[PDB]
Symmetry: C3
Subunit: 117 residues, 3 copies
């Protein structure tokens, strides 16, 4: 029963809890919309932030998604790359799905559109 | 038979190898006990520490679990959050299981009990 | 069909784009050869770097692997451990496979050979 990673990326303008939660929620909702993801099918999720964001764990946003309270999530620091995109939040959402690898819809929002291949 | 993540978190009082390994092992053992986990059913494990812990990789504790020598494990730095729990170690253990998402037993020990939902 | 993590580690001599990409590419190619891995069977990959590496994301090397353009990858920062191996890049490649846990071929190259059990 196949499992696949779904990637998301977005950015915030400021390091505040309000903006980190708002943008993270918007990113998750878009991933959910595009991939028709049900929470019970999510194995786990990893969220990362660049080391310029500190106000809150982006995973707190998952609680604002009804039905997602049992989805296991953890946060990590993104690698600090010289010249890399700043104030960036990324998601690796691992899901049970039969959608082929090439049709998985990865989501890039805000200033992270530049990360689109 | 699906793949699911199991979360664990704990804390240490000191940044010493002895305590990091002791608390990590205790956390792993509690997870294994509550979820009846066999090492062959573990896809992989991720361990994280806040950036105030430097004495040893928590993954070294896995060596102390009989039969877990082939479980793939890697470590990462936890996101540094203002006012966040200090000296915190987390686990994301990915397993094959029949247990429904809402019945998976996530484990929070020591000062990380405040993380429980 | 079970899922399994496949670990890789390697090192670079200096923090440059050329070295990071070359050594990461070499590590990935060796994992792929040893485990006969096809990109469609890869759930996702996580790459990490110790905090002395900033030149480029090692994930950029995945784009040099023909056919791997749809494999989801994200990078994270490795813990800073005292006496820990410096300038180190690690891979956790999650794949669907029947191969028993004890027969999975994990790969350690360059100065990271000291990590292998
Ligand atoms: O579950 C934990 O260990 C938490 O500290 C909570 C939480 C979350 O808000 O969901 C935040 C940060 C951790 O990296 C993972 C999850
Ligand atoms: O095999 C490696 O990559 C190691 O360096 C060893 C080890 C471990 O203690 O098991 C320690 C740190 C790494 O993040 C992952 C695993």
């Amino acid at each position: 029963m196949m499992i696949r990673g779904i990637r998301g990326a977005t950015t915030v303008e400021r390091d505040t809890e309000e903006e980190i939660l708002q943008k993270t929620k918007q990113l998750l909702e878009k991933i959910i919309e595009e991939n028709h993801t049900k929470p019970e099918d999510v194995v786990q999720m990893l969220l990362s932030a660049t080391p310029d964001l500190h106000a809150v764990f982006p995973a707190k946003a998952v609680r604002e998604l009804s039905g997602w309270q049992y989805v296991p999530v953890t946060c990590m620091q993104e690698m600090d790359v010289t010249g890399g995109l700043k104030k960036c939040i990324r998601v690796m959402m691992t899901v049970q799905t039969d959608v082929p690898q090439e049709q998985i819809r990865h989501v890039y929002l805000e200033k992270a559109v530049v990360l689109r291949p």
